[PDB]
Structure formats: structure tokens, C-alpha cells
């Protein structure tokens, strides 16, 4: 799984160790081994929600399975709560797009997962 | 809806007003209240298009519905035109990828839209 | 096609001309004309892979066709190898997501590729 967070929160407001926390929490939440979890946090972005520059985040979770209606509700409660708390973003200014990737469409280590 | 623009045009070339203007135009094009519209502009990128470093942009519009070939022509005429003019980019060096998201695959406010 | 590379390798570690090289390599591998290929490299990123901040990359290739199980294996061998060598990244710390785009879902020049 790959989790990306783009945010207008500045880098100094991003806790050191957020990427480790996300890695461990995503391992637990998805049941996928930590070895396969990648995280990418992009602070200082020029972004708006509702046309305003108040703190916001646009995120994505890509995974080969472990994605779907009920699971994504759970993920959204976990990850909106964690980002809202850690980055001080209102949860109604966070989107998370979920992507169920086919194993044939993910390259890694010079091959694909198919 | 979520609109993302990645460009090699510098930050000083991005009008302060542009994210508000994009919000207004996307609200007209989609009918959605600003509350649901997110815009993300990423200037100063290392990019090429046709193997050249001339000004370009790579963009995405994610929307729950309201996506398809006919409708995307309307979005493309609107958004290519506006970005070309505001960012001083030739319209033939702008791509916009459209993504029709399932409501179950968009997290917001601690839940999903499903 | 569009190829994006996000990496924690610093900008100084990106060899000059890598985006030209990627353009050429993608052109030959996909059979798409270079004129339609865009490349975006995003260095200095805050990233982890397996919970470690060692060099890694997360990439995407979007293309109208030329995507599929066998093709993607060929692209992955080529692009993992090239990025590993150029950016000094272990191949087991690179993901590449592939996306087969409908022509109707790619806007370009004020229209779409389905209409061009």
C-alpha cells in the first residue's frame, strides 16, 4: 500500500515521525506487512478547500486489495482522525481517494505483483 | 471535485487569485458548492512535455460522477483555456486526466460519501 | 503518456538530462511518439518505504493503451533498472503504478484525445 498526503500545513508543523506512525497504523489497519507500505507527505502546498487557504489535505491510498466500501469507511475514520489531530486540519477539509490496484498494474523490484 | 495542476511555471507566475477563480469555475461546471471543491497548484516543477522544458502542465480532475467523454470536452475547453491564459502555457502542452470516483472510494469528514 | 517519479533523493542527485532519457525510453518501450510524452520528476520528498527513509521512489505511468500484464512487466524491468542506476535507489524500494486511460478521459489542447 502507498499513502500520500498533500497539505498546505507547513513542514515545521509536520511531526517528525509522522511517516513512521502512518506506516505502523496503515500496517495495522490494512493487515498488509509494513515491508510493503510506502508513505509520502508533501507539506507547504498551495491548495484550497472551499476557496480558502485554511489547513486542508488531499490524500490517496493505493492498495492491491484491502480496499472497498466498508473498509474505506474505517480507513477514513482512522486517517481523517489521525491527520486532523496530528496536522490540526478540520476533517471536513480532508479528502482521501482510495484506489484498488490490480496486481498486474503495480511494478516493484523490476517486475509486477501479478 | 478535486482539481490538481502540476506545472514548471514558477510560483510568481501563479496569480494569488487563481485558486479562488478555479473554485468558482469548477462550481459552475459541476454545480457543486465550494465546500466540496478542492484545488491544488504545484508550480516550479521539474517537467518535460514532448522532450522539452517549455511551459507545460499536467492536471487531474477527480469527481464523483459528472465525468465522461462529452462532458470532459466541456471541462477541457474551460480549464485548458483558463490555465493557458493565467499561467502563460500553450494549451497543447496541458494534459488533464479525468477520474470518475465511486462515492465509496472518497473519504471526507471521517467517513465516505457512499 | 505521462510518467511521474516522486523520490526522496535530492535534486542534486538527479542527473541532468534524465527527463530526456525517460522521454526517449518511454517512447521506444510504449511505441508512442515522444511528442506526446510528459515526464515529471519530484525530488527532495518526504517519504518512507518499509518504514525507512532510505532512497526510494513512487512512480506512475499513465497511458492511453499500451498497458497490460506483459507490457507492464517489460516497463517495470526497464524503469526500475533505469531509475535504480540513475538515482541510486534499490529496485525493491521503487513502486510504479500503471493506469490505462480512456482517450475520453484525457483532456488536451482544449479538447480530449477522443475528439482529436
Residue numbers in the entry:
A (entry chain C), B (entry chain B): 1 to 114
C (entry chain A): 1 to 116
What do the paper's sentences say?
Macrophage migration inhibitory factor (MIF) is a pro-inflammatory cytokine with pleiotropic functions in various pathophysiological processes. Unlike all other cytokines, MIF has a tautomerase activity, and it performs this enzymatic function through an N-terminal catalytic proline base. Our analysis showed that like human MIF, MaMIF also forms a trimer in solution. Alignment of the primary sequences of MIF from hamster, mouse, and human was performed with PRALINE program. Figure 2A indicates that MaMIF shares 93% and 89% sequence identity with mouse MIF and human MIF, respectively.
The crystal structure of MaMIF was resolved to 1.8 Å resolution. It forms a trimer, with three identical molecules in an asymmetric unit. A monomer of MaMIF is made up of six beta strands, four of which form a mixed beta sheet within one subunit, two antiparallel alpha helices and two shorter beta strands on either end of the sheet. The trimer adopts a barrel-like architecture formed by three inter-connected monomeric subunits, as has been reported for other MIF structures. The trimeric MaMIF structure is retained by the short beta strands β3 of one monomer and β6 of the third monomer becoming part of the beta sheet formed by the beta strands β1, β2, β4 and β5 of the second monomer in between, together forming a six-stranded beta sheet. Herein, β3 of monomer-1 comes in close proximity and form hydrogen-bond network, typical of beta sheets, with β2 of the monomer-2 and β6 of monomer-3 comes close to β5 of monomer-2. This contribution of beta strands by all three monomers to their respective adjacent monomers to form beta sheets seems to provide stability to the trimeric structure. The alignment reveals that the residues responsible for tautomerase activity and substrate binding such as Pro2, Lys33, Ile65, Tyr96, and Asn98 are conserved in MaMIF as well. As the residues of the catalytic pocket and ISO-1 binding are completely conserved in MaMIF, ISO-1 and other similar compounds binding to the catalytic pocket would block MaMIF catalytic function as well. However, the MaMIF structure from this work did not have any sulfate ions, presumably because the final crystallization condition did not have any sulfate.
